[PDB]
Amino acid sequence: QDLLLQSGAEVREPGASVTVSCQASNYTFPDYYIHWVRLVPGQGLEWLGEMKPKVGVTNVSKKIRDRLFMTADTSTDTAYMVLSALTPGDTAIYYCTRLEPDFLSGWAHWGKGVLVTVSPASTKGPSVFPLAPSSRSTSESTAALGCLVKDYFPEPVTVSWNSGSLTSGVHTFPAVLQSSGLYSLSSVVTVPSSSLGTQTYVCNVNHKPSNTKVDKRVE
Amino acid sequence: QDLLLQSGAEVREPGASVTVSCQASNYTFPDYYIHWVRLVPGQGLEWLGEMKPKVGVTNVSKKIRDRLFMTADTSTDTAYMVLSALTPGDTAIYYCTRLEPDFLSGWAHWGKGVLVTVSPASTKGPSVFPLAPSSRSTSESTAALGCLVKDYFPEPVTVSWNSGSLTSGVHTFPAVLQSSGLYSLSSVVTVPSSSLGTQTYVCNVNHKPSNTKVDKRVE
Amino acid sequence: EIVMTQTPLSLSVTPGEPASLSCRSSASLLHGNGNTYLHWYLRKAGQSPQLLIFGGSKRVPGISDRFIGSGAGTNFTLKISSVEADDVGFYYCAQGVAFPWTFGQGTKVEIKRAVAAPSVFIFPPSEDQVKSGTVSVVCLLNNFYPREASVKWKVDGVLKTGNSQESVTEQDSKDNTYSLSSTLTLSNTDYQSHNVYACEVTHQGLSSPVTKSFNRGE
Amino acid sequence: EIVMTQTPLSLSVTPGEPASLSCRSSASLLHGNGNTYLHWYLRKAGQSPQLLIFGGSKRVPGISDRFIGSGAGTNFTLKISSVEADDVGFYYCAQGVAFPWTFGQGTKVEIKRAVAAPSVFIFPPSEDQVKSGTVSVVCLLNNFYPREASVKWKVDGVLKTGNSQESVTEQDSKDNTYSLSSTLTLSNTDYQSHNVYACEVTHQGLSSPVTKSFNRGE
């Protein structure tokens, strides 16, 4: 039941060598195999490798046998996985698996898998704008608020409206790669035309490593 | 030749972690003892630990030990070390080392080193700034022409004069990390002030860790 | 190399219903003994998968009521007796076979809904974004079902250049509908190279095609 | 624990000069099997460390036998018969058999050179820094020997406060003087409160301290 610990993400240049690391629960830790599974975006999951830290050994996918290395620190069973010559194609979420002394005849549960991402990109705070921007005129009933995030890196971003004082009818589109390797995102709020023709509205946006806030007031 | 390959530099946020790697030359890899050691900025050299590949760890500084993890892969003929709980002052040139002959008598030996750096910051393009042709009002016969960067991050920086096409009588005052958490630099060229050829003096500068290039001349 | 066909590739269904999923393979599915075998699991919002079958018939301890399946080797198939809102996500099966082993591609599970058109919007680029030299405008399609709408654009009444990209919400937490953003991008000069900018739509909840536009200089 | 020192800390040495450094240990080092195991290392700017001598006195192949050295169990010395530019660098000593945690703090060779005043310049930065909220006023102290100089600012006849930054050459490649950039840097406000700006300087090769100066606008 109780979960392995596995921490947060990193972002990288191509051809590099890059690592993820993972740790035992309220648990004994040399005693059973470890498995590494890659969750690749838009695609089915992928087994890389079995490992046993006790001897410092593995069984390995023939798709690799070259770029990987794996073990754990026997002082903590702090698992390490090392990958090398990283392509943008390797941009994925990596999941640290135990194996369960009976249930491994099928499988076992994991800790929290971690993202890593590969691109020639570098940090940018977003460019930001209104969208909707107001109905200049329509069949007034509802319309929406809207704001743009663009030219941005890396994803994710944090966003809210009237500092998140507003919550109902708010939506946030999942991110899109611009061909430069930057990101765009957007947020929108469907709202009554009476309310829109009355109150002041702002889209409130934040991220690190851009260390940047924007609070775009809209009409 | 009697060498350890080591590769490109690194930088991190405080509280994070780092991986450093070293590769043997064409040699009987398991038979060396290895030290990991570091050169720390403005400070004395420091041994950290000792490793023999198929053994793994042998001896380590009690100071670093718990933060440290150290290992090697035979299959690749490579050493590693990992530092956890990564912080300022850990900033150093990490070296792996070769020991094998009468090395008890002292024989640590070297690869090329790798630089590790820690900061709160994220990458910034240069505050490039030209430095004036001051005393154009009053010069007798001699002068110098300068250019500057401020708040660029992270270092190093490429710099040139007349866009490299003429470079002599010049100082390139080594950069310093400011209280911004970002770098400042200047270079200056000595000039016989009769030089109307000063028209040519494009200082030109490049910033691969932020994918950036810039230029100015002043008169 | 070991085959795993998992199907339906996607599924949408109403609450309380029966539903079933099939896994097909090239062989028998053991690490040894003649006797270790397949397992099935559910993945959602970035948590690891949650195991459901351990071993063909073997239900995972403490899990739901029966997703349980049947078959052997080249054949297996789950069935759940009742759709719960909990159940939406990705389902996949794994073989209990000697490794190296490979996932089949995964099966999508969703709630089914009455078909419903989006509310639809487009607008000029904001003028700061215009004089940023690279420029964009957005066709927005709020709250509709299913996400099998299709979207178009015309500039001076003639179909777009293809300088455009799109994104959809998750399945709505409660309405189980969706929204869509389509974005068209311009330089400021491409934004001069036409005058009226339009987006056009066809969808299940559309009785007929829909059109919206703005024209610049207004 | 192994605790040790090495001296002199640094020196500028004349070309052709016989010279030496001594490494002094609080641990008497009749090491391992009753046999002293100690060594010395070079390093240079941007370079790997380099072997010199080991077991006390035993030289590594390819060293110029200009380099020489030996020592009693707490009392060790490295020596050079002569000085050529290739000698300029850093020198270290250490201990070993199974317990490698040691270093001497390093000692720096420089070369002894004729005394020299710098050429000196200063500038007002353009308004482009001023309007950007921060002002750096910089003074350039170029081609001086020996290694030491002091640098200062005045504003409206009143001495420096708060900030400074400084940066220096590695002696030289060629003449083996030194060159120094330094600044006082301010919020633009402060410079706008100020009106007159000067750097001030002193060094061994001067008759007196030296001013360079300008005023706001002109």
JSON list of C-alpha atoms in Angstrom, two decimals, chain D residues 54-190:
[
{"chain": "D", "resi": 54, "resn": "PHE", "atom": "CA", "xyz": [55.67, 12.00, -4.27]},
{"chain": "D", "resi": 55, "resn": "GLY", "atom": "CA", "xyz": [56.98, 9.84, -1.40]},
{"chain": "D", "resi": 56, "resn": "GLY", "atom": "CA", "xyz": [58.41, 13.20, -0.42]},
{"chain": "D", "resi": 57, "resn": "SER", "atom": "CA", "xyz": [61.24, 13.66, -2.92]},
{"chain": "D", "resi": 58, "resn": "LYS", "atom": "CA", "xyz": [60.45, 11.30, -5.87]},
{"chain": "D", "resi": 59, "resn": "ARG", "atom": "CA", "xyz": [59.83, 13.26, -9.13]},
{"chain": "D", "resi": 60, "resn": "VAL", "atom": "CA", "xyz": [57.21, 12.31, -11.75]},
{"chain": "D", "resi": 61, "resn": "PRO", "atom": "CA", "xyz": [58.63, 11.74, -15.29]},
{"chain": "D", "resi": 62, "resn": "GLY", "atom": "CA", "xyz": [58.85, 14.74, -17.63]},
{"chain": "D", "resi": 63, "resn": "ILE", "atom": "CA", "xyz": [59.12, 17.40, -14.90]},
{"chain": "D", "resi": 64, "resn": "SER", "atom": "CA", "xyz": [62.02, 19.78, -15.44]},
{"chain": "D", "resi": 65, "resn": "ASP", "atom": "CA", "xyz": [64.62, 18.65, -12.84]},
{"chain": "D", "resi": 66, "resn": "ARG", "atom": "CA", "xyz": [64.87, 22.39, -12.13]},
{"chain": "D", "resi": 67, "resn": "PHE", "atom": "CA", "xyz": [62.20, 21.29, -9.66]},
{"chain": "D", "resi": 68, "resn": "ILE", "atom": "CA", "xyz": [63.67, 19.55, -6.58]},
{"chain": "D", "resi": 69, "resn": "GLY", "atom": "CA", "xyz": [62.46, 18.74, -3.03]},
{"chain": "D", "resi": 70, "resn": "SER", "atom": "CA", "xyz": [62.60, 16.59, 0.14]},
{"chain": "D", "resi": 71, "resn": "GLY", "atom": "CA", "xyz": [61.52, 16.61, 3.84]},
{"chain": "D", "resi": 72, "resn": "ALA", "atom": "CA", "xyz": [61.64, 15.28, 7.40]},
{"chain": "D", "resi": 73, "resn": "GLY", "atom": "CA", "xyz": [58.36, 13.85, 8.81]},
{"chain": "D", "resi": 74, "resn": "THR", "atom": "CA", "xyz": [56.62, 17.26, 9.47]},
{"chain": "D", "resi": 75, "resn": "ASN", "atom": "CA", "xyz": [59.03, 19.48, 7.54]},
{"chain": "D", "resi": 76, "resn": "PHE", "atom": "CA", "xyz": [59.00, 19.30, 3.75]},
{"chain": "D", "resi": 77, "resn": "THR", "atom": "CA", "xyz": [60.20, 21.48, 0.89]},
{"chain": "D", "resi": 78, "resn": "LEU", "atom": "CA", "xyz": [59.67, 21.97, -2.85]},
{"chain": "D", "resi": 79, "resn": "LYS", "atom": "CA", "xyz": [62.39, 23.91, -4.74]},
{"chain": "D", "resi": 80, "resn": "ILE", "atom": "CA", "xyz": [63.19, 25.28, -8.19]},
{"chain": "D", "resi": 81, "resn": "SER", "atom": "CA", "xyz": [66.69, 26.10, -9.48]},
{"chain": "D", "resi": 82, "resn": "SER", "atom": "CA", "xyz": [65.42, 28.89, -11.75]},
{"chain": "D", "resi": 83, "resn": "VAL", "atom": "CA", "xyz": [62.47, 30.98, -13.05]},
{"chain": "D", "resi": 84, "resn": "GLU", "atom": "CA", "xyz": [60.93, 30.95, -16.53]},
{"chain": "D", "resi": 85, "resn": "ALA", "atom": "CA", "xyz": [57.38, 32.12, -17.42]},
{"chain": "D", "resi": 86, "resn": "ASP", "atom": "CA", "xyz": [56.06, 28.54, -17.58]},
{"chain": "D", "resi": 87, "resn": "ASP", "atom": "CA", "xyz": [56.60, 28.31, -13.75]},
{"chain": "D", "resi": 88, "resn": "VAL", "atom": "CA", "xyz": [53.82, 30.90, -12.97]},
{"chain": "D", "resi": 89, "resn": "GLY", "atom": "CA", "xyz": [50.97, 28.95, -11.33]},
{"chain": "D", "resi": 90, "resn": "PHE", "atom": "CA", "xyz": [49.76, 27.32, -8.08]},
{"chain": "D", "resi": 91, "resn": "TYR", "atom": "CA", "xyz": [51.39, 24.71, -5.85]},
{"chain": "D", "resi": 92, "resn": "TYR", "atom": "CA", "xyz": [49.93, 22.27, -3.32]},
{"chain": "D", "resi": 93, "resn": "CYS", "atom": "CA", "xyz": [51.03, 19.41, -0.99]},
{"chain": "D", "resi": 94, "resn": "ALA", "atom": "CA", "xyz": [49.21, 16.34, 0.52]},
{"chain": "D", "resi": 95, "resn": "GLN", "atom": "CA", "xyz": [49.24, 12.89, 2.30]},
{"chain": "D", "resi": 96, "resn": "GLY", "atom": "CA", "xyz": [48.17, 9.22, 1.58]},
{"chain": "D", "resi": 97, "resn": "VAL", "atom": "CA", "xyz": [47.82, 5.42, 2.12]},
{"chain": "D", "resi": 98, "resn": "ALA", "atom": "CA", "xyz": [44.11, 4.77, 2.86]},
{"chain": "D", "resi": 99, "resn": "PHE", "atom": "CA", "xyz": [43.01, 8.17, 4.36]},
{"chain": "D", "resi": 100, "resn": "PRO", "atom": "CA", "xyz": [43.32, 10.76, 1.56]},
{"chain": "D", "resi": 101, "resn": "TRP", "atom": "CA", "xyz": [41.53, 13.73, 3.25]},
{"chain": "D", "resi": 102, "resn": "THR", "atom": "CA", "xyz": [44.26, 16.44, 3.08]},
{"chain": "D", "resi": 103, "resn": "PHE", "atom": "CA", "xyz": [45.38, 19.54, 1.26]},
{"chain": "D", "resi": 104, "resn": "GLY", "atom": "CA", "xyz": [47.81, 22.38, 1.72]},
{"chain": "D", "resi": 105, "resn": "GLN", "atom": "CA", "xyz": [45.90, 25.63, 1.00]},
{"chain": "D", "resi": 106, "resn": "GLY", "atom": "CA", "xyz": [47.85, 26.34, -2.23]},
{"chain": "D", "resi": 107, "resn": "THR", "atom": "CA", "xyz": [50.61, 28.86, -2.91]},
{"chain": "D", "resi": 108, "resn": "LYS", "atom": "CA", "xyz": [50.90, 31.15, -5.97]},
{"chain": "D", "resi": 109, "resn": "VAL", "atom": "CA", "xyz": [53.97, 31.82, -8.09]},
{"chain": "D", "resi": 110, "resn": "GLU", "atom": "CA", "xyz": [54.00, 35.23, -9.75]},
{"chain": "D", "resi": 111, "resn": "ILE", "atom": "CA", "xyz": [57.00, 36.85, -11.53]},
{"chain": "D", "resi": 112, "resn": "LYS", "atom": "CA", "xyz": [59.04, 39.79, -10.26]},
{"chain": "D", "resi": 113, "resn": "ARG", "atom": "CA", "xyz": [58.84, 42.79, -12.58]},
{"chain": "D", "resi": 114, "resn": "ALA", "atom": "CA", "xyz": [59.88, 46.46, -12.95]},
{"chain": "D", "resi": 115, "resn": "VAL", "atom": "CA", "xyz": [57.60, 48.94, -11.11]},
{"chain": "D", "resi": 116, "resn": "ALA", "atom": "CA", "xyz": [55.11, 50.87, -13.22]},
{"chain": "D", "resi": 117, "resn": "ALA", "atom": "CA", "xyz": [52.28, 53.40, -12.93]},
{"chain": "D", "resi": 118, "resn": "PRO", "atom": "CA", "xyz": [49.04, 52.51, -14.73]},
{"chain": "D", "resi": 119, "resn": "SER", "atom": "CA", "xyz": [47.47, 54.53, -17.47]},
{"chain": "D", "resi": 120, "resn": "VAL", "atom": "CA", "xyz": [44.06, 55.59, -16.01]},
{"chain": "D", "resi": 121, "resn": "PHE", "atom": "CA", "xyz": [40.66, 56.42, -17.56]},
{"chain": "D", "resi": 122, "resn": "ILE", "atom": "CA", "xyz": [37.05, 56.96, -16.28]},
{"chain": "D", "resi": 123, "resn": "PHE", "atom": "CA", "xyz": [33.68, 57.63, -17.95]},
{"chain": "D", "resi": 124, "resn": "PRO", "atom": "CA", "xyz": [30.17, 58.93, -17.42]},
{"chain": "D", "resi": 125, "resn": "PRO", "atom": "CA", "xyz": [27.82, 56.11, -18.56]},
{"chain": "D", "resi": 126, "resn": "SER", "atom": "CA", "xyz": [25.19, 57.21, -21.11]},
{"chain": "D", "resi": 127, "resn": "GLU", "atom": "CA", "xyz": [21.68, 58.24, -20.12]},
{"chain": "D", "resi": 128, "resn": "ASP", "atom": "CA", "xyz": [20.59, 54.78, -21.31]},
{"chain": "D", "resi": 129, "resn": "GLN", "atom": "CA", "xyz": [21.71, 53.30, -17.99]},
{"chain": "D", "resi": 130, "resn": "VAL", "atom": "CA", "xyz": [20.48, 56.39, -16.06]},
{"chain": "D", "resi": 131, "resn": "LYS", "atom": "CA", "xyz": [16.92, 56.09, -17.47]},
{"chain": "D", "resi": 132, "resn": "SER", "atom": "CA", "xyz": [17.10, 52.29, -16.79]},
{"chain": "D", "resi": 133, "resn": "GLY", "atom": "CA", "xyz": [17.21, 53.08, -13.01]},
{"chain": "D", "resi": 134, "resn": "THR", "atom": "CA", "xyz": [20.90, 52.12, -12.30]},
{"chain": "D", "resi": 135, "resn": "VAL", "atom": "CA", "xyz": [24.18, 53.99, -12.85]},
{"chain": "D", "resi": 136, "resn": "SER", "atom": "CA", "xyz": [27.62, 52.38, -12.93]},
{"chain": "D", "resi": 137, "resn": "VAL", "atom": "CA", "xyz": [30.54, 54.83, -12.97]},
{"chain": "D", "resi": 138, "resn": "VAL", "atom": "CA", "xyz": [33.72, 52.98, -13.91]},
{"chain": "D", "resi": 139, "resn": "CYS", "atom": "CA", "xyz": [37.42, 53.76, -13.70]},
{"chain": "D", "resi": 140, "resn": "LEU", "atom": "CA", "xyz": [40.10, 51.81, -15.57]},
{"chain": "D", "resi": 141, "resn": "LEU", "atom": "CA", "xyz": [43.53, 51.34, -13.91]},
{"chain": "D", "resi": 142, "resn": "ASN", "atom": "CA", "xyz": [45.69, 49.81, -16.56]},
{"chain": "D", "resi": 143, "resn": "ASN", "atom": "CA", "xyz": [49.23, 48.34, -16.67]},
{"chain": "D", "resi": 144, "resn": "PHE", "atom": "CA", "xyz": [50.59, 48.81, -13.12]},
{"chain": "D", "resi": 145, "resn": "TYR", "atom": "CA", "xyz": [53.29, 46.94, -11.17]},
{"chain": "D", "resi": 146, "resn": "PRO", "atom": "CA", "xyz": [53.59, 45.77, -8.34]},
{"chain": "D", "resi": 147, "resn": "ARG", "atom": "CA", "xyz": [50.28, 43.88, -7.90]},
{"chain": "D", "resi": 148, "resn": "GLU", "atom": "CA", "xyz": [48.61, 46.27, -5.43]},
{"chain": "D", "resi": 149, "resn": "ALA", "atom": "CA", "xyz": [46.50, 49.40, -5.92]},
{"chain": "D", "resi": 150, "resn": "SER", "atom": "CA", "xyz": [43.76, 51.20, -3.92]},
{"chain": "D", "resi": 151, "resn": "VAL", "atom": "CA", "xyz": [40.73, 52.78, -5.65]},
{"chain": "D", "resi": 152, "resn": "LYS", "atom": "CA", "xyz": [38.10, 55.20, -4.40]},
{"chain": "D", "resi": 153, "resn": "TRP", "atom": "CA", "xyz": [35.26, 57.48, -5.44]},
{"chain": "D", "resi": 154, "resn": "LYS", "atom": "CA", "xyz": [34.04, 60.96, -4.60]},
{"chain": "D", "resi": 155, "resn": "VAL", "atom": "CA", "xyz": [30.68, 62.54, -5.41]},
{"chain": "D", "resi": 156, "resn": "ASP", "atom": "CA", "xyz": [30.34, 66.34, -5.04]},
{"chain": "D", "resi": 157, "resn": "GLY", "atom": "CA", "xyz": [33.69, 66.27, -3.14]},
{"chain": "D", "resi": 158, "resn": "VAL", "atom": "CA", "xyz": [32.34, 63.60, -0.69]},
{"chain": "D", "resi": 159, "resn": "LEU", "atom": "CA", "xyz": [33.82, 60.09, -0.33]},
{"chain": "D", "resi": 160, "resn": "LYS", "atom": "CA", "xyz": [32.28, 56.79, -1.46]},
{"chain": "D", "resi": 161, "resn": "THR", "atom": "CA", "xyz": [29.49, 55.01, 0.37]},
{"chain": "D", "resi": 162, "resn": "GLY", "atom": "CA", "xyz": [27.72, 51.64, -0.22]},
{"chain": "D", "resi": 163, "resn": "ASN", "atom": "CA", "xyz": [28.61, 49.75, -3.41]},
{"chain": "D", "resi": 164, "resn": "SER", "atom": "CA", "xyz": [31.76, 48.96, -5.33]},
{"chain": "D", "resi": 165, "resn": "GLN", "atom": "CA", "xyz": [32.89, 46.30, -7.83]},
{"chain": "D", "resi": 166, "resn": "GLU", "atom": "CA", "xyz": [36.48, 45.48, -8.91]},
{"chain": "D", "resi": 167, "resn": "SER", "atom": "CA", "xyz": [38.15, 43.00, -11.37]},
{"chain": "D", "resi": 168, "resn": "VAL", "atom": "CA", "xyz": [41.82, 42.38, -12.32]},
{"chain": "D", "resi": 169, "resn": "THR", "atom": "CA", "xyz": [44.17, 40.68, -14.79]},
{"chain": "D", "resi": 170, "resn": "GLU", "atom": "CA", "xyz": [46.23, 37.56, -14.03]},
{"chain": "D", "resi": 171, "resn": "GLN", "atom": "CA", "xyz": [49.35, 39.79, -13.95]},
{"chain": "D", "resi": 172, "resn": "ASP", "atom": "CA", "xyz": [49.78, 39.90, -17.79]},
{"chain": "D", "resi": 173, "resn": "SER", "atom": "CA", "xyz": [50.34, 37.51, -20.66]},
{"chain": "D", "resi": 174, "resn": "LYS", "atom": "CA", "xyz": [53.20, 39.82, -21.82]},
{"chain": "D", "resi": 175, "resn": "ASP", "atom": "CA", "xyz": [54.64, 42.73, -19.79]},
{"chain": "D", "resi": 176, "resn": "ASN", "atom": "CA", "xyz": [53.56, 41.27, -16.46]},
{"chain": "D", "resi": 177, "resn": "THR", "atom": "CA", "xyz": [52.12, 44.39, -15.00]},
{"chain": "D", "resi": 178, "resn": "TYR", "atom": "CA", "xyz": [48.42, 44.24, -13.95]},
{"chain": "D", "resi": 179, "resn": "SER", "atom": "CA", "xyz": [45.22, 45.98, -15.12]},
{"chain": "D", "resi": 180, "resn": "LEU", "atom": "CA", "xyz": [42.16, 46.71, -12.94]},
{"chain": "D", "resi": 181, "resn": "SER", "atom": "CA", "xyz": [38.63, 47.81, -13.71]},
{"chain": "D", "resi": 182, "resn": "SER", "atom": "CA", "xyz": [36.55, 49.13, -10.80]},
{"chain": "D", "resi": 183, "resn": "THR", "atom": "CA", "xyz": [33.29, 51.04, -10.22]},
{"chain": "D", "resi": 184, "resn": "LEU", "atom": "CA", "xyz": [30.96, 52.62, -7.74]},
{"chain": "D", "resi": 185, "resn": "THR", "atom": "CA", "xyz": [27.38, 51.79, -8.90]},
{"chain": "D", "resi": 186, "resn": "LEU", "atom": "CA", "xyz": [24.18, 53.57, -7.77]},
{"chain": "D", "resi": 187, "resn": "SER", "atom": "CA", "xyz": [20.44, 53.92, -8.26]},
{"chain": "D", "resi": 188, "resn": "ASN", "atom": "CA", "xyz": [19.97, 56.65, -10.88]},
{"chain": "D", "resi": 189, "resn": "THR", "atom": "CA", "xyz": [18.31, 58.78, -8.19]},
{"chain": "D", "resi": 190, "resn": "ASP", "atom": "CA", "xyz": [21.59, 58.99, -6.34]}
]
